[PDB]
Amino acid sequence: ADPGVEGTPVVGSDLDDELHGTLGSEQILGGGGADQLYGYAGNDLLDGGAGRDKLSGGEGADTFRFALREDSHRSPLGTFGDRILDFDPSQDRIDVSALGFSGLGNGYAGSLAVSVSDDGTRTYLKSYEADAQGLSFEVALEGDHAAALSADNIVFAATDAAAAGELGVIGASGQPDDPTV
Ligand SMILES: [Ca+2]
Ligand SMILES: [Ca+2]
Ligand SMILES: [Ca+2]
Ligand SMILES: [Ca+2]
Ligand SMILES: [Ca+2]
Ligand SMILES: [Ca+2]
């Protein structure tokens, strides 16, 4: 075995990249260009920067923090929402407080309302808060686990875990039939 990492933010910040990271914890920043970022194993921190970025968190509890208000957002000019390949909605988290919103919008089961492209292709998650300038937050996911997304893994509560976990999904009811045929 021989290390010699070609990834990490050390190279290609302002232009399109292919960064393959280590099997340990890292801070990954894409910078400019449509980057292909791969965090792999370890608890990683990931920012995309300018452009529509394609990114994997990999194994470990990852933090998709993003750079500024100008990252993973939509504006009247067009969308710049990033494209996450393998987000784990149980283990990983996505920050949005400094860049998008602090109060979650419309949604149910402790979530934000999800969207799909069609029968296939990517799924999306949207925030329904926007700036008066039309700067809103949306992000695309191609793992198609929209059915498991929750606002619990969307971190706007300053990473404080004193609250949350409030669910009322539990329950049972029925209308039984009694045929004799
Ligand atoms: Ca780059
Ligand atoms: Ca980028
Ligand atoms: Ca890593
Ligand atoms: Ca980006
Ligand atoms: Ca990882
Ligand atoms: Ca992960």
Swiss-Prot record:
**Which keywords are on file for this protein?**
Alginate biosynthesis, Calcium, Isomerase, Repeat, Secreted
Q: Where are the Hemolysin-type calcium-binding repeats?
A: 30-46, 48-64
According to its UniProt entry, the protein's GO biological process terms are: alginic acid biosynthetic process
Q: In which compartments does the protein localize?
A: Secreted
- Which Gene Ontology molecular function entries are recorded, alphabetically? calcium ion binding; isomerase activity
Question: In the UniProt record, which is one GO cellular component term?
Answer: extracellular space
Which family is it part of? Belongs to the D-mannuronate C5-epimerase family.
**Domain remarks in the Swiss-Prot or TrEMBL record:** Composed of one catalytically active A module and three R modules.
Task of the protein: Converts beta-D-mannuronic acid (M) to alpha-L-guluronic acid (G), producing a polymer with gel-forming capacity, required for the formation of the cyst coat.
Q: Any remaining note in the record?
A: Each enzyme of this family of C5 epimerases introduces its own characteristic sequence distribution of G-blocks in their substrates, explaining the extensive sequence variability of alginates. These alginates of varying composition have different physical properties and are necessary at different stages of the bacterium life cycle.
What name appears for this protein in its UniProt entry?
Mannuronan C5-epimerase AlgE6
- Print the organism lineage: Bacteria, Pseudomonadati, Pseudomonadota, Gammaproteobacteria, Pseudomonadales
The gene name on file is algE6
Covered residues, full protein: 695 to 874 of 874
